[PDB]
Design a protein around this ligand. Structure first.
Ligand SMILES: CC(C)C[C@H](N)C(=O)OP(=O)(O)OC[C@H]1O[C@@H](n2cnc3c(N)ncnc32)[C@H](O)[C@@H]1O
Ligand SMILES: Nc1ncnc2c1ncn2[C@@H]1O[C@H](COP(=O)(O)OP(=O)(O)OP(=O)(O)O)[C@@H](O)[C@H]1O
Ligand SMILES: [Mg+2]
Ligand SMILES: [Zn+2]
Length: 875
């Protein structure tokens, strides 16, 4: 064994050893229990950084732990390859998105290889390859013919200068981002997944997910946004019917989740596009102006909660069906057309939005709910005004005295008796719009025929292949300018026809890749029956909270769709979910002569601080002129504060990088990049290396201690106690708690105790061998390179065949104590008690002592003094 730790040498050799043994290349082996650990696959946008590495190290720790415990572990890696990153690169570097993507995949894969993750590279997928996306095209056509995918007009942001559709994140103050031109709302046919048909399933199946973080489930529940409410119809008054046609001339229908407050409605509000708004604004220019203002606004919820709620009266009136009140209709900017009926009732006394609205326009506020003996001031909103739980109804006729649910059911029965309303369930969830007017994405497998309509491409003709020899420019999608792509024949009639030129939302690739990994070369379906049956669901998913809503909802949705197609037989894709904390790092920039600022990478700057740490120098390593030190932010390409792992690996090795990530913080907690934390990890790896070297120097390897430890010295018994307490702790930290930083600390404490133990004797060396053989296996999931090498210097068996260390329970028992039993302070007996014996057990054992019971003369104990470890005194 070489004396000094040299990661640059031992890490490649360890990786070759694992690759040659194929320990991470797994089959559907029925002779071993399966375990599917999955980390969210990256966008191949250039270079991974230490944030990504933290994510993938967490998964590797979990995977290697399960591997050592004899699981057949699949840990797959892949590339989420479609999307806007490559198209922007195409407009910048004038290169094809495909070529840019594949160049990035090559570099990033070597980044991953250098870190030594136990990945099945034979299951690698790249979602931009036809062999992959043909199957989401396949599922698209199957669902299209069922109506689960459908085509309908939707609204988009049209830029009249750049000649392209814009995402809602690229429209600033109603104008384009790179143009400043006023954005037009344009209706165009697009494709949708009818996810609303699965809303109840997607909502209720969350309860099955007992090993998901509650906040993730809460966020998905709020996104789906189920409510149990009441449809309520207010008959239009006779004086207010002019210009109204059909049902809108007879009644105004609204949806409310508080039908228990219907006796407290004081006004009603409709959306600008509502037929009552249009009819009232026919002769009223002020209402036309207000309507036009509404339609020229962002219905996005982001701007709506921050929106100043405005309204105008209409002079039209409706009748509350329960108390006969005549209520005025208002047009209001917060009422959204397309959500429910586009019309709401207002109860200012018990809804905060209605309270502030009525405080602006001085509209009536009528209390219909009392919550105990609390004071109701019509001029002050209080948090209990809208309490659904502990409130009771007032001013409500025969509803007086009922709670929320009883009043809800009563109002339901009354309204249905009058034909004026009925219970109704609604959802905030909208259908999932798939169409993107972009090039670098999965083509939509639809053919447009002027005789046959929108026709799905037959499965034999799938994939519709995206041409890769394309350099987008931004002036619209190039597919729509490529007749060699879009000119085709109709698959139903054979006539001339045109391919759909929109591509799919790239969330589609990530909604099923976890199944594709189970059989990534299967050419007869999305996933082979046998591999799906073997792997079941993902046992462990690890990824950032930014994908907790959309990605996870879409993946659960696709899972149910594929199940209903008979492709898989699970209801949920991910059993356990781990949301790793963000790696954050200080940022640096320089003011650009073009106005803005240019962000510099931390590895290209030099910072010299004072003796008190006072930042006094911060120069760029390319000129030596200063640079601006800025705030500490999430590690990302955005502010160019991404630390390249290859830089860290060249300086310190993969194991140092992995150890720093796993030790610096609990995995869910944010992790600040630290040069000192890196140095601290490296020093521990040298310590570990030195420990094994100095151990083998003084005599070489022996058989590890095992079996009966009677006759072992007290110091060695204590070391074995620390050893097996550590094995128990680390096993729980990896398996149950998933807290890796404390597992490493536990192993460090064991080595601290080892360091203070004389292990030179024959028995001492056997215990030393046991401790070191355990320590290197306990740490192997974190730092497998150094642990693999150190293990082979200690022992000749394969580390993965020796398996995870076992807890020797006999090593955990401490010696028994002899306690003196006194009666009135006079020594009358002795008891032998456990070292863990409580004071109640000492009392119980002393009362039952032979010499104690005789010298107690049948008299009871007035007091029992218990000195643990010394005496019990019965008086
Ligand atoms: C399933 C798909 C929708 C996933 C999609 N392709 C994606 O998110 O790909 P992306 O390449 O963006 O990230 C890959 C993983 O790395 C994490 N991550 C990134 N930056 C950091 C950081 N500073 N600190 C900690 N973790 C970080 C991020 O949360 C994610 O789990
Ligand atoms: N088109 C609409 N635009 C704006 N608000 C509406 C619309 N339709 C209904 N509302 C109002 O939203 C209220 C409840 O909102 P929603 O349907 O989102 O349920 P919720 O927020 O879960 O319910 P709660 O307010 O009890 O928490 C209803 O009482 C109604 O007054
Ligand atoms: Mg269960
Ligand atoms: Zn046709």
């Amino acid at each position: 064994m070489q004396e000094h730790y040299q990661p640059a040498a031992i890490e490649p050799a360890a990786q070759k050893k694992w690759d040659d043994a194929r320990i991470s290349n797994v089959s559907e082996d029925a002779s071993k229990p399966k375990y599917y650990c999955l980390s969210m696959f990256p966008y191949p946008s250039g270079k991974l950084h230490m944030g990504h590495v933290r994510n993938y190290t967490i998964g590797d720790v979990l995977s290697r732990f399960k591997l050592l415990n004899g699981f057949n572990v699949m840990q797959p890696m892949g590339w989420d390859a479609f999307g806007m990153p490559a198209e922007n690169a195409a407009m910048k570097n004038n290169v094809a998105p495909a070529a840019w993507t594949y160049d990035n995949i090559e570099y990033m894969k070597t980044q991953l290889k250098s870190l030594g993750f136990a990945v099945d590279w034979e299951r690698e997928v790249a979602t931009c390859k036809p062999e992959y996306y043909r199957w989401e095209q396949w599922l698209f056509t199957k669902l299209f013919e069922k109506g689960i995918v459908y085509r309908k007009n939707g609204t988009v942001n049209w830029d009249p200068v750049d000649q392209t559709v814009l995402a809602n994140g690229q429209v600033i103050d109603g104008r384009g981002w790179r143009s400043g031109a006023l954005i037009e709302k344009r209706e165009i046919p697009m494709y949708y997944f009818k996810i609303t048909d699965y809303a109840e399933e997607l909502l209720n199946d969350l309860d099955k997910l007992e090993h998901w973080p509650e906040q993730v489930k809460t966020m998905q529940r709020n996104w789906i946004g189920k409510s149990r409410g009441m449809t309520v119809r207010f008959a239009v008054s006779d004086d207010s019917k002019q210009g109204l046609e059909g049902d809108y001339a007879k009644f105004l229908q609204v949806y409310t989740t508080r039908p228990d407050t219907l006796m407290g409605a004081t006004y009603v509000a409709v959306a600008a596009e509502h037929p009552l708004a249009t009819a009232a604004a026919a002769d009223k220019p002020e209402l036309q102006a207000f309507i036009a203002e509404c339609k020229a606004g962002s219905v996005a919820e982001a701007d709506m909660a921050t929106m100043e709620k405005k309204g105008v009266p209409t002079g039209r009136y409706v009748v509350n069906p329960l108390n006969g009140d005549k209520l005025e209709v208002w047009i209001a900017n917060y009422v959204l057309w397309g959500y429910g009926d586009g019309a709401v009732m207002a109860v200012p006394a018990h809804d905060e939005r209605d309270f502030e609205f009525a405080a602006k326009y001085n509209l009536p506020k009528k209390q219909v709910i009392a919550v105990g003996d609390n004071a109701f001031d019509a001029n002050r909103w209080q948090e209990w005004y809208g309490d659904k739980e502990n409130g009771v109804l007032v001013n409500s006729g025969d509803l007086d005295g009922l709670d929320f649910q009883t009043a809800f059911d009563a109002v339901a029965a009354k309204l249905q008796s009058q034909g004026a309303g009925e219970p109704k369930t609604q959802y905030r969830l909208r259908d999932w719009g798939i169409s993107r007017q972009r090039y670098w994405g999965c083509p939509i497998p639809i053919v447009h025929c002027e005789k046959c309509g929108n026709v799905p491409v037959p499965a034999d003709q799938l994939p519709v292949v995206l041409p890769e020899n394309v350099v987008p420019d931004g002036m619209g999608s190039p597919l729509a300018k490529m007749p060699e792509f879009y000119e085709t024949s109709c698959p139903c009639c054979g006539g001339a026809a045109k391919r759909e030129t929109d591509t799919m939302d790239t969330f589609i690739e990530s909604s099923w890749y976890f199944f594709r990994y189970m059989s990534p070369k299967f050419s007869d379906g999305m996933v082979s029956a046998e591999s799906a049956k073997y792997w079941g669901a993902v046992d462990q998913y690890i990824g950032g909270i930014e994908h907790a809503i959309l990605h996870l909802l879409y993946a659960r949705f696709f899972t149910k769709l594929m199940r209903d197609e008979g492709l898989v037989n699970v209801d949920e894709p991910f059993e356990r979910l781990l949301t790793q904390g963000m790696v954050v790092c200080e940022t640096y920039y320089r003011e650009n002569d073009k106005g803005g600022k240019d962000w510099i990478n931390p590895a290209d700057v030099e910072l010299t601080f004072d003796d008190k740490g006072r930042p006094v120098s911060a120069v760029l390593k390319a000129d030596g002129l200063p640079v601006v030190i800025s705030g500490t932010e999430k590690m990302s390409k955005s502010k160019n504060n991404g630390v390249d792992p290859q830089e860290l690996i060249n300086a310190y090795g993969a194991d140092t990088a992995r150890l720093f990530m796993m030790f610096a913080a609990p995995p869910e907690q944010s992790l600040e990049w630290s040069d000192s934390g890196v140095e601290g990890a490296h020093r521990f790896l040298r310590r570990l290396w030195r420990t094994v070297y100095e151990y083998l120097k003084q005599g070489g390897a022996v058989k590890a201690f095992a079996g009966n430890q009677d006759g072992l010295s007290k110091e060695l018994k204590d070391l074995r106690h620390k050893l097996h307490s550590t094995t128990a702790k680390v096993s729980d930290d990896y398996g149950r708690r998933q807290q890796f930083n404390t597992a490493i600390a536990a192993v460090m404490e064991l080595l601290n105790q080892y360091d203070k133990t004389d292990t030179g004797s024959e028995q001492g060396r056997a215990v030393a061998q046991e401790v070191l053989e355990a320590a290197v296996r306990l740490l192997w999931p974190i730092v497998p390179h150094i642990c693999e090498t150190l293990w082979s210097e200690l022992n000749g068996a394969k580390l993965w065949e020796a398996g995870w260390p076992t807890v020797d329970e006999a090593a955990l028992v401490k010696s028994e104590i002899e306690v003196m039993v006194q009666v009135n302070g006079k020594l009358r007996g002795k008891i032998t008690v456990a070292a863990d014996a409580s004071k109640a057990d000492l009392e119980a054992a002393a009362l039952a002592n032979e010499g104690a019971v005789k010298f107690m003369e049948g008299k009871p104990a007035k007091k029992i003094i218990v000195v643990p470890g010394r005496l019990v005194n019965i008086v």
